[PDB]
Amino acid sequence: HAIYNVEVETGDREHAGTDATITIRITGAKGRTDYLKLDKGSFEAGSKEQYTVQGFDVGDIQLIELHSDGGGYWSGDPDWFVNRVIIISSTQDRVYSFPCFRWVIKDMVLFPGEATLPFNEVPAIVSEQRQKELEQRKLTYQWDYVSDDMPGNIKAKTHDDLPRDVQFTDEKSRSYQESRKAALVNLGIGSLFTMFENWDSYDDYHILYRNWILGGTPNMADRWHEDRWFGYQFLNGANPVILTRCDALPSNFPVTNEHVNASLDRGKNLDEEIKDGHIYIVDFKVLVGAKSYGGPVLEDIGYKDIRYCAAPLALFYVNKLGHLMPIAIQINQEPGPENPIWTPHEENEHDWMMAKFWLGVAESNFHQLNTHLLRTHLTTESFALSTWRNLASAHPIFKLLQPHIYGVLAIDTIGRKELIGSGGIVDQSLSLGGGGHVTFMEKCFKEVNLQDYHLPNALKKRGVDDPSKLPGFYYRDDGLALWEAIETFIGEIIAIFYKNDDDVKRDNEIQSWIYDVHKNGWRVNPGHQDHGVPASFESREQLKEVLTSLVFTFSCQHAAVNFSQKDHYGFTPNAPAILRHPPPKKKGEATLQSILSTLPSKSQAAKAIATVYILTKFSEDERYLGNYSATAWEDKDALDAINRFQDKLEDISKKIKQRNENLEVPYIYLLPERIPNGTAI
């Protein structure tokens, strides 16, 4: 016989423990034991429990099987979250370590030692079980679709229909649910307080964030009205993704030197500043055709509980102090007397302010639906699903992606009801709410390309990556630093397990992984551009590029466009998401009163703040970038790669803080200690 010393580490998360009867069957080269009881004592969350069991000497241990009887009559939560099992056999000179970090329901098969690619040499029984795991994954994790024009999502009616491995932790479920309750209370209390207020000032909106715990007054609250800070936010606000270098005015945006001459201040005319790379532009043309709440359909000319959006163009200028200044706005796409060019030098100041608000409403709806919901959450969710469908838990790239894919399946399943469903949050707080929001995301998705998720390439393509021409762009600076740190780390992980490109080509799981997304995830359906998802991987560098794009997006990109929302939307006039009247068809009409009647109502503004409160709440159990304390790595070289990655992030963090000390408005959304590994809220 053999004596087996068995140590089981139960995860610390809530309900990780169990009182089910647990047995373990040990398999090795010489045969296998029966199921042996692990009976003495409890399995509480966070516990490390030891057992001594005796049975057939299996020789070199090759795998183990945990079995749970699923509890008895009085068992409240039999499911068991196991970090790892450690076994020592009295006949083997070796310590066997079996990482898990998954929920144990009834049966769990675990392998000892380092991650492997499917063709790496292992006992036949290990390969069989690996294949069986993947077959089961295909049954549990299934594609579903909002429509032909949306990226694939996980099939699940509600959150609690999800496999437990991809549900929120109970801590995050509580963080979320309590945040919704608090929101309701703060809205109710605020509603009582402001119930009979005469709203006749921009500064009335300040009251709406006062009784909220937001981590501080929105940092734009005292400066939203200043052109410099309005411009600033196209670099450092919630939507830093659409500004591009302007190398020629669009034909439908006939800005002349005469329009903007009073704004230039380096001694040169508009044409020269364009050539010098100091002129930038945003074009919201994708919003043409958008259907907003109550019926309005946006046209190239503008328009012919009723809400409105716009598809503006706006021109910006990097002045001699390095400030990005708004110098011209055209509210909709087709130029003319009824859709003129507005500038800071409007004779009627209220007309310039109103133009900025129209630009704001377009940005808000673009940001929330395209930049945030579609291009982080819904599109990366396809990759998270494919990870579970196609990569075995023993696969090194499963281990890599596990901390980064956490959350997105859970929050998106919750969101398909609560956020974009009928009567949902969007219906209440965005101009495009009421149904047009889904059509808009569909429209945006048809243009989505995986190459968009490559930060250096995208910044280059936009012409915004030259700090000498475009200074004070901290999303860029911090994002590029983080990108390089993630890319370097991922490259080192790949080199440990993939020794050459042939190793990549032969890995049927990673091949199945990217193919599943290519064919069933980001489907190139009628009317779609190519989505840039490869059908296969041919090299280590190509694998690195996709994984970096993905991990950066799950963590950093989502953080930059989500946790920035309190500063951005907290003071509503800084970024309205609803407007209540159509755009003007001539100059001279705007007054403070007509503007206030056009801006969101008290209740619409309050709801936007409530939503922002919920979407930006960090959970008490959040794990931030590079915190891999709950990962399943065993390989010493992999642990070393992780050490180097974490030390690099620490250096990046110090540099960002030092940078921030000299800024009027610190840029903090890309501090590693504030970036969740995943997209979970």
Contact residues toward Fe ion (CB under 5 A) are 562
Q: How far is the CB of 490 from Fe ion (least distance, A)?
A: 23
d(CA 468, CA 461): 17
Name the amino acid, one letter, at 583: P
Which of Ca ion, Fe ion, Cl ion, none lies near 33, with the C-beta cut-off 5 to 8 A by kind?
Answer: Cl ion
Give me the numbers of helices (H) and strands (E) for the chain, helices first please. 22, 16
Among 21, 31, 22, 17, smallest CA distance to 89 is for: 31
Which of Ca ion, Cl ion, Fe ion, none lies near 55, with the C-beta cut-off 5 to 8 A by kind?
Answer: Cl ion
Q: How far is the CB of 14 from Ca ion (least distance, A)?
A: 9
Q: How many Å is the Cα radius of gyration of the chain? A: 28
Name the amino acid, one letter, at 573: P
Which of Cl ion, Ca ion, Fe ion, none lies near 34, with the C-beta cut-off 5 to 8 A by kind?
Answer: Cl ion
Please identify, using beta-carbon distances, which residue of 98 and 230 lies nearer to Cl ion.
98
Q: How far is the CB of 674 from Fe ion (least distance, A)?
A: 14
Which of Fe ion, Ca ion, Cl ion, none lies near 114, with the C-beta cut-off 5 to 8 A by kind?
Answer: Cl ion
Distance of CA 359 to the CA centre of its chain: 24
How many other CB atoms sit within 10 Å of the CB of residue 277? 17
Please identify, using beta-carbon distances, which residue of 79 and 381 lies nearer to Ca ion.
79
Phi, psi dihedrals of residue 86, rounded to the nearest 5°: -120, 130
Per-residue contact flags (x/-) with Cl ion for residues 634 to 663, judged by CB under 5 A:
xx----------------------------
d(CA 286, CA 311): 7
Decide: is 34 part of the binding site for Cl ion (CB under 5 A).
Answer: yes
d(CA 111, CA 114): 9
Please identify, using beta-carbon distances, which residue of 56 and 624 lies nearer to Fe ion.
624
d(CA 144, CA 161): 14
Phi, psi dihedrals of residue 497, rounded to the nearest 5°: -100, -30
Please identify, using beta-carbon distances, which residue of 549 and 562 lies nearer to Fe ion.
562
Which residue is it, tokens 């070199």?
60
Please identify, using beta-carbon distances, which residue of 459 and 641 lies nearer to Ca ion.
641
Among 325, 327, 323, 321, smallest CA distance to 344 is for: 327
Distances in Å between the Cα of 184 and the Cα atoms of 172, 423, 563, 610 are 18, 16, 21, 8
Q: How far is the CB of 77 from Ca ion (least distance, A)?
A: 4
Phi, psi dihedrals of residue 178, rounded to the nearest 5°: -65, -30
How many other CB atoms sit within 10 Å of the CB of residue 414? 18
Please identify, using beta-carbon distances, which residue of 517 and 641 lies nearer to Ca ion.
641
d(CA 461, CA 248): 15
Please identify, using beta-carbon distances, which residue of 393 and 611 lies nearer to Cl ion.
393
Can you tell me which of 33, 179, 239, 562 binds Cl ion, judged by CB under 5 A?
A: 33
Phi, psi dihedrals of residue 66, rounded to the nearest 5°: -90, 135
C-beta separation of 575 from 364 below 8 A: yes
Distances in Å between the Cα of 85 and the Cα atoms of 4, 9, 28, 43, 49 are 12, 6, 16, 13, 10
DSSP strand E in 529-597: where?
Answer: none
Distances in Å between the Cα of 524 and the Cα atoms of 246, 387, 519 are 31, 20, 8
Where on the chain is the footprint of Ca ion (CB under 5 A)?
Answer: 15, 18, 41, 49, 77, 79, 643
Please identify, using beta-carbon distances, which residue of 11 and 433 lies nearer to Ca ion.
11
Q: How far is the CB of 459 from Fe ion (least distance, A)?
A: 22
Which span (110-118, 156-164, 265-273, 543-551) binds Cl ion, by CB under 5 A?
110-118
Which of Fe ion, Ca ion, Cl ion, none lies near 15, with the C-beta cut-off 5 to 8 A by kind?
Answer: Ca ion
Which of Ca ion, Cl ion, Fe ion, none lies near 155, with the C-beta cut-off 5 to 8 A by kind?
Answer: none
Please identify, using beta-carbon distances, which residue of 159 and 523 lies nearer to Ca ion.
159
Please identify, using beta-carbon distances, which residue of 305 and 640 lies nearer to Cl ion.
640
- The SS3 assignment for 647 reads helix
Q: Which residue is nearest to Fe ion (CB)?
A: 562
Give the sign of the dihedral formed by CA 515, CA 517, CA 522, CA 526: positive
- What is the DSSP-derived secondary structure letter of residue 302? B
Q: Which residue is nearest to Ca ion (CB)?
A: 41
Chain residues 614-633 in contact with Cl ion, contact rule CB under 5 A? 633
Chain residues 37-96 in contact with Cl ion, contact rule CB under 5 A? 55-56
Please identify, using beta-carbon distances, which residue of 318 and 625 lies nearer to Fe ion.
625
Please identify, using beta-carbon distances, which residue of 99 and 676 lies nearer to Fe ion.
676
Decide: is 35 part of the binding site for Cl ion (CB under 5 A).
Answer: no
Which of Ca ion, Cl ion, Fe ion, none lies near 562, with the C-beta cut-off 5 to 8 A by kind?
Answer: Fe ion
**Which residues, in sequence order, are CB contacts of 426 under 8 Å at separation 6+?**
368, 369, 419, 420, 432, 433, 437
Please identify, using beta-carbon distances, which residue of 343 and 631 lies nearer to Cl ion.
631
Lookup: tokens for 656: 């960002």
Decide: is 330 part of the binding site for Cl ion (CB under 5 A).
Answer: no
Can you tell me which of 114, 412, 465, 487 binds Cl ion, judged by CB under 5 A?
A: 114
Which of Ca ion, Cl ion, Fe ion, none lies near 634, with the C-beta cut-off 5 to 8 A by kind?
Answer: Cl ion
Q: Which residues pair with 81 in a beta bridge?
A: 103
Q: Which residues bind Cl ion (CB under 5 A)?
A: 33-34, 55-56, 114-115, 633-635
